[PDB]
Structure 1
């Protein structure tokens, strides 16, 4: 019964992303900044190779259990810490624990579900845990912040974090270090492969699109359309709901459609949607492009996550910690320098021109995905 491992990875991703999306609106309010926001992604980017090597020395369960212990301490510190230095330390600890959870859980899903289609299906659900977490983070945080108090959301998360830990002690039960069998291809060998580079680049550019869109779209809104406070929250809501739907459907569906074709169509759709965003004049005109952006990024992510495991299964040694380190690096590159570069370029040349540049880059990189098809 490997469904318990799937449940634990689903819950770990869900709770990690709930914490990630809950800490966002509260802290500026609690403190009343870019380095604090980017510290999690930077630390995760730095420690991804080390976790990729460590899971090959001691196994997956011990790094996964430590992810809960660091997550529990990070959650407890988040509840009581009121200093910027301690918030930064907690954020970086969350980065280390999220690196452990992401890399080791994706590796254990890939090593437990070795089927090519079941792997896509179960990473569809697991990434759907991430989508559900990003969906219900802000609402849960806001309601429990208004009703009970500032530290109430952190304590409830801490209770389920402990409960995930009890199942983790019951079945993961990592009493002792057990070494893996075979040595993975060095990271340098992995980084010379052009197709792994193309897959990572597609993930990086598609995700950097949304990473620079999400904090810069309201900046355009308050100056052009003068939207009210709730409209900003509801404007990006179709993106999140469509990301949930796209992840859950396309984890199942992209194998039949074709992962290369699904990625290419997602790249074109996100490029055209980003190109059409500057033409919109009101929220009803933004419902369709945001839905398309989220839908297409769901296609791309749910099609390129299993392809990273497929690439090493085809070309290299089948150890997944180190290649999912690269896959997570692709995300962290977009999510680390995203807001800063987006703001800088928007101030320099303009927001519509920035989005046109993103669309052109996406559209021109889309033909590169043609090489990802299987030779037969």
Structure 2
């Protein structure tokens, strides 16, 4: 009964993303009110991803020395403290500290859970099958975070969403203490193929680069689209929110379908087609004149990104099993880093380029870069 571990990682990802998307609208308003009663806000937004990026390799090295369960339970304890600090703290320094601890706990959870999933489901097809479901938790959390936070802030109070999240985190921790049972410290068997040797591999580099560019696309699209919308179409407030919902729905559908469908078609071909489709959709985005023109390209973007992730997350596993020692916590530490890249320099770099040249040229450059990198996935094909 290893489905409990899958449920644990699914819940961890879901709750992490729920907190991430719940905290996003509340912080700018009351922070500005307290200042009354650009650089710092960008620093606050990027601190979580920066700290996660910095602490990924250390978790990758520590899971080899002590194992997965102790790092996972620490992810529950840091995320519980971050959720209670977010609920009770109202100053800038305490906010920065909470967002940074959230980053540390999210690094622990992501790296250790992906390593444990890869080590428990050692079959090649089942690995992708379960990683698709686990990646679906991110989409579910992003989808259900904003409405949950909005209603709970609307009716009960400001601290109510955070207290409810804390109760759910406690339930998750109780389940973890029942099944995971992190009582003693157990070392792993063999060595870990140090990061310096793994970073010289061109195939791992190609997979990581594909993930990084595919995610940086949406990471720079998401905060730069409403600014263009309000100036071109003069859209209303709710239309700014409902326009990016097709991306979140299509990501869920595409992940859950292609986690199973990528093995039969070919992981390299699925990644190549995902790159081509996301590039074409980003290129067609600037031509839209009203919300209905934007519905379809967003669906294409989400579908393609789901394809790419659900094909390239299980391959990072297959490449170390094939060319290195079968220890996963340090290779997934690389993969997670790719994600953090998109979340670290995404919004800031996207803003400056858009002010300097314009938004259609930014989208054209993203699309051209994705289209040109797509042939590189041809080298990822299995030799037989």
1:286-314: CA deviation from partner (whole Å, max 9, x where unpaired): 00000000010000011110010011011
1:133-167: CA deviation from partner (whole Å, max 9, x where unpaired): 01101111111111111111101111110011111
Q: Displacement of 1:30 after TM fit?
A: 2.2
Rounded to whole Å, the distance in 1 between the matches of 2:262 and 2:31 is 44
Rounded to whole Å, the distance in 2 between the matches of 1:31 and 1:253 is 46
Rounded to whole Å, the distance in 2 between the matches of 1:37 and 1:297 is 23
Matched ranges for 1:308-347 at <5 A: 308-347=316-355
1:353-376: CA deviation from partner (whole Å, max 9, x where unpaired): 000000000000000011111011
Q: Displacement of 1:257 after TM fit?
A: 1.5
Q: Displacement of 1:176 after TM fit?
A: 1.1
Rounded to whole Å, the distance in 2 between the matches of 1:156 and 1:339 is 30
Rounded to whole Å, the distance in 1 between the matches of 2:297 and 2:129 is 27
Extract structure 1 runs of 4+ deviating beyond 4 A: none
Rounded to whole Å, the distance in 2 between the matches of 1:315 and 1:226 is 54
Alignment partner of 1:135 is 2:143: yes
Please identify, of 328-337 and 24-33, the stretch whose mean Cα deviation from structure 2 is larger: 24-33
Rounded to whole Å, the distance in 2 between the matches of 1:207 and 1:293 is 10
Out of 42, 62, 65, the residue aligned to residue 57 of structure 1 is 65
Rounded to whole Å, the distance in 1 between the matches of 2:125 and 2:47 is 35
Q: Displacement of 1:340 after TM fit?
A: 0.3
SS in 1 for 2:353: helix
Q: TM-score, normalised by structure 1?
A: 0.99
1:204-230: CA deviation from partner (whole Å, max 9, x where unpaired): 000000000000011110110111000
Q: Displacement of 1:181 after TM fit?
A: 0.7
Rounded to whole Å, the distance in 2 between the matches of 1:371 and 1:303 is 15
Q: Displacement of 1:29 after TM fit?
A: 1.6
SS in 2 for 1:293: helix
1:237 corresponds to which residue? 245
Alignment partner of 1:8 is 2:8: yes
Q: Displacement of 1:242 after TM fit?
A: 0.4
1:11-59: CA deviation from partner (whole Å, max 9, x where unpaired): 0111011011111111102212110110000000000000000000110
Rounded to whole Å, the distance in 1 between the matches of 2:92 and 2:261 is 45
1:93-148: CA deviation from partner (whole Å, max 9, x where unpaired): 00000000000000000000011111101110110011100110111111111111
Rounded to whole Å, the distance in 2 between the matches of 1:225 and 1:162 is 45
Quote the RMSD (CA, aligned, Å): 0.6
Rounded to whole Å, the distance in 2 between the matches of 1:178 and 1:323 is 20
Rounded to whole Å, the distance in 1 between the matches of 2:239 and 2:137 is 25
SS in 2 for 1:31: helix
Unaligned runs of 5+ in 2: 33-40
1:156 corresponds to which residue? 164
Count of aligned pairs between the two proteins: 376
Rounded to whole Å, the distance in 1 between the matches of 2:84 and 2:196 is 38
1:286 corresponds to which residue? 294
Rounded to whole Å, the distance in 1 between the matches of 2:260 and 2:107 is 26
SS in 1 for 2:158: coil
SS in 1 for 2:182: coil
1:160-183: CA deviation from partner (whole Å, max 9, x where unpaired): 100111111111110111101111
1:94 corresponds to which residue? 102
Rounded to whole Å, the distance in 2 between the matches of 1:233 and 1:246 is 21
Q: TM-score, normalised by structure 2?
A: 0.97
Rounded to whole Å, the distance in 1 between the matches of 2:133 and 2:30 is 34
Rounded to whole Å, the distance in 2 between the matches of 1:354 and 1:318 is 41
Matched ranges for 1:333-372 at <5 A: 333-372=341-380
Out of 193, 212, 215, the residue aligned to residue 220 of structure 2 is 212
Unaligned runs of 5+ in 1: none
Rounded to whole Å, the distance in 2 between the matches of 1:66 and 1:227 is 44
SS in 2 for 1:197: helix
1:208-266: CA deviation from partner (whole Å, max 9, x where unpaired): 00000000011110110111000011000000000111111111111111111111101
Q: Displacement of 1:320 after TM fit?
A: 0.7
1:109 corresponds to which residue? 117
